[PDB]
């Protein structure tokens, strides 16, 4: 044929179709769209009569004046469909002047569905049998055409026909070409001109029968002018339609390892097929391009765009999602947004290594660089001009670089730059060169001494907690009083607390936003001073909103003003962990109780909401609820059954405290002048219980307790109440013995029987049934009260003769069984 060529994408001109002068199998997708200034006299001399098999799809979206497709693509045979468009493989949408479809030669579209829409002059759509062209027929979409109202006389020529839905219409593409069909003995290989079938490998047309060297669309794989089902070594599969050697798959990996813009798809060798990327848990060895599996965390690998990538917000960080090792420089410039608590730790919380130089230029929203949580090294192969590798300017709120106790940084070359970072202190950029080691390979770095430390403190003293007392819900916190040497300067104290799962919480972590915090900041006014070593001068604060059996973290932070020399003071206590006490828990929630036998209950509940400690066991009582005795007085055969401190407020409140200090500093200056019972069961570490040894169909009441500490004179909760029933036995409702008849002379008879010796709940009614064999039956309801008064039943209105009488007693469960036919007989 010709040679392979990649996929086009043409728009608004026609001069781009010259690049199909020699293409034969365009691998990729061809989509011709949005051509407006094209009259039909521009489409007469244009023809590609050797385009034979395209792999991905086809798309014709608002071309104008395309009169028919029978002169552009007159020899399409197979479209493959590896990559699809809305899961559609052929899309004809909104053309005008399109009379006939006319793609008269395509035989087997492999995968997809055809979508033909809204092209208002198109017929020859009804005579196209899509049952034998695409194999998966039920997803095509052919609506709103010319042929909603049938007007155009689509007569076609002598050409074979089939049936599709009961109508025996003829089959034709155009008015001069009809749809080629092959009889069903040789299904998919396609027939020749007279009706023999082709070789067992080909798709569609074949030139000469039973010769696999010369058909025109190989179904499985193409190999060197022959046709083959599985390409043997030393060849490899590629894009699942043709086969290449190792040398034809290697060199283009290096030929577009450098991108024009994108990408290339860097090819790997993995199990006889050149694939774009290996799956998860597999990584390429760079020597011979083989694909080998993993141990531990696998590199991704994330290279980047042109050496420097800037993060402005979260949407800029989305390209670096999951990226582990980065081969270039990086720069962060974050200003704001919404919900900045955990998202900056989410996008880059698994970063491993960075190899250029890092810039924290113009960043304001951050408080700390602790979101490089897994970062171990900035080795810095490429260098920033000025021989730098670490640069930081315009950091107005940055306070803490990294925790050098739970983390070990290193670096090798380059220099550092910390300028105009007021809140970043000086001893913390003295604490990094023991861990980073730039006192080794010793170099003169350039950090100015006065450019940091403003609105910051590092000579803080250590506050010691004095007394702690825990109740079930409150804790008091009094500590030792800290004074700066000028005691007017201390505005007040700041306390911080948060729940803690373990003993590993660090001091400034996770808040990292503009006006948000993970902790719960609470204030307290300072106490008074009386120049007395022992007095009522220890400060205090009461904490109220606690939870039982929790474990918290607490520390104390002062807040003082500045004398006019940039000489601050302050203090900060240690991180102390406090734990509460235990109260009795709450009730066990939503108990349920299903039965499965005549004497068993099983239970299912939930553990309580607030356990308030390690729950050691449960406790369960069951008592009997005998019978609702007011149910004794109802005739049952009548109806049925009865049963904000913003930043502007910080400055103006600190100005007013420095205004009151200034006046009474002036007043001393001029006025002094110098001289010249129920049973119980104890279930441990479970949420179910199988009660046994019970009476049948008697409602039990069950009380539940959840009990947390047992050995030192146990305490536990209010009981949860539930009710249960047992499934009744079936045999225990039958009338024992033959029912005795007593014949009085005045045609009222006494039918007496005995009640069953162990009923299920109560026997509420009796159904007696006297009947002459050959005569109708009349039912009688015998009430409980009538049987209790008469010890039987007096049956009135009885003509003489023999009678078959059936006796039953309706209880609260169901029917029992009828007795023998009670024959009281008199000889006629």
């Amino acid at each position: 044929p010709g040679e392979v060529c990649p996929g086009m994408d043409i728009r608004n001109n026609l001069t781009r179709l010259h690049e199909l002068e020699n293409c034969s199998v365009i691998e990729g997708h061809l989509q011709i769209l949005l051509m407006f200034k094209t009259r039909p006299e521009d489409f007469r001399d244009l023809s590609f009569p050797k385009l034979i098999m395209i792999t991905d799809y086809l798309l014709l979206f608002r071309v104008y004046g395309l009169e028919s497709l029978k002169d552009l693509f007159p020899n399409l045979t197979v479209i493959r469909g590896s990559r699809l468009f809305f899961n559609y493989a052929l899309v004809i949408f909104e053309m005008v002047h399109l009379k006939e479809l006319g793609l008269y030669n395509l035989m087997n579209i492999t995968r997809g569905s055809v979508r033909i829409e809204k092209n208002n002059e198109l017929c020859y759509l009804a005579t196209i049998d899509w049952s034998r062209i695409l194999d998966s027929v039920e997803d095509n979409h052919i609506v709103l055409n010319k042929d909603d109202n049938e007007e155009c006389g689509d007569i076609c020529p002598n050409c074979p026909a089939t049936v599709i839905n009961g109508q025996f219409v003829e089959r034709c593409w155009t008015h001069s070409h009809c749809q080629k069909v092959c009889p069903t003995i040789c299904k998919s290989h396609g027939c020749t001109a007279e009706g023999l079938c082709c070789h067992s490998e080909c798709l569609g047309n074949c030139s000469q029968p039973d010769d696999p060297t010369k058909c025109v669309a190989c179904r499985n794989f193409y190999l060197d002018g022959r046709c083959v089902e599985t390409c043997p070594p030393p060849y490899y599969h590629f894009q699942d339609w043709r086969c290449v050697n190792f040398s034809f798959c290697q060199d283009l990996h290096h030929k577009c390892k450098n991108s024009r813009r994108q990408g290339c798809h860097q090819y790997v060798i993995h199990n006889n097929k050149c694939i774009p990327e290996c799956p998860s848990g597999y990584t390429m060895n760079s020597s011979n391009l083989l694909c080998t599996p993993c141990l531990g965390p696998c590199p991704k690998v994330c290279h980047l765009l042109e050496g420097e990538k800037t993060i402005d917000s979260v949407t800029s960080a989305q390209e670096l999602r999951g990226c582990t090792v980065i081969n270039g420089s990086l720069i962060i410039n974050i200003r704001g947004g919404n919900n900045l608590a955990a998202e900056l730790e989410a996008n880059l919380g698994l970063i491993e290594e960075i190899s250029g130089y890092l810039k924290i230029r113009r960043s304001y929203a951050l408080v700390s660089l602790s979101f490089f949580r897994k970062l171990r090294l900035i080795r810095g192969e490429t260098l920033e001009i000025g021989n730098y590798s670490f640069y930081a300017l315009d950091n107005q709120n940055l306070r803490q670089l990294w925790d050098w106790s739970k983390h070990n940084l290193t670096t090798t070359q380059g220099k550092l730059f910390f300028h105009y970072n007021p809140k970043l202190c000086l001893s913390e950029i003295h604490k990094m060169e023991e861990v980073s080691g730039t006192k080794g390979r010793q170099e003169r770095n350039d950090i100015a001494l006065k450019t940091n430390g403003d609105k910051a403190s590092c000579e803080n003293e250590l506050l010691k907690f004095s007394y702690i007392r825990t109740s079930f819900d409150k804790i008091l916190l009094r500590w030792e009083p800290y004074w700066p040497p000028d005691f007017r300067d201390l505005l007040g104290f700041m306390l911080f607390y948060k729940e803690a799962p373990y003993q590993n919480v660090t001091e400034f972590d996770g808040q990292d936003a503009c006006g948000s915090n993970s902790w719960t900041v609470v204030d307290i006014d300072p106490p008074l001073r009386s120049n007395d070593p022992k007095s009522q001068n220890h400060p205090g604060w009461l904490m109220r909103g606690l939870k039982p059996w929790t474990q918290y973290a607490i520390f104390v932070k002062t807040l003082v003003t500045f004398s006019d020399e940039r000489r601050t003071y302050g203090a900060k206590s240690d991180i102390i962990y406090v734990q509460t006490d235990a109260t009795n828990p709450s009730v066990p929630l939503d108990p349920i109780s299903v039965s499965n036998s005549s004497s068993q209950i099983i239970l299912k509940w939930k553990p309580p909401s607030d356990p308030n400690g390690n729950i050691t066991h449960y406790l369960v009582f069951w008592e009997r609820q005998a019978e609702d005795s007011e149910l004794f007085e109802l005739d049952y055969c009548l109806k049925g059954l009865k049963l904000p401190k913003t930043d502007s407020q910080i400055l103006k409140e600190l100005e007013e405290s420095s205004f009151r200090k200034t006046f009474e500093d002036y007043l001393h200056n001029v006025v002094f002048v110098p001289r010249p019972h129920r049973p119980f069961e104890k279930v441990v570490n479970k949420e179910s219980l199988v009660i046994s040894g019970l009476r049948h169909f008697t409602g039990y009441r069950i009380e539940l307790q959840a009990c947390n500490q047992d050995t030192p004179e146990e305490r536990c909760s209010v009981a949860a109440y539930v009710s249960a029933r047992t499934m009744p036995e079936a045999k225990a409702d039958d009338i024992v013995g033959p029912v005795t008849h007593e014949i009085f002379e005045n045609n009222v008879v006494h039918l007496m029987w005995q009640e069953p010796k162990e009923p299920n709940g109560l026997i509420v009614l009796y159904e007696v049934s006297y009947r002459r064999y050959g005569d109708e039956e009349l039912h009688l309801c015998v009430s409980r009260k009538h049987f209790a008064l008469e010890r039987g039943c007096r049956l009135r209105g009885l003509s003489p003769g023999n009678y078959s009488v059936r006796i039953r007693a309706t209880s609260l469960a169901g029917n029992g069984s009828w007795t023998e036919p009670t024959y009281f007989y008199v000889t006629d």
């Binding site: 000028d486 500093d665 001393h668 200056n669 002094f672 002048v673 110098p674 001289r675």
Partner: peptide
Amino acid sequence: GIVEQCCTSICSLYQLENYCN
């Protein structure tokens, strides 16, 4: 100035005895 020689530094009891005659 009492607030500059007994607040910016320590002052002895020989010094602030001058303030009372």
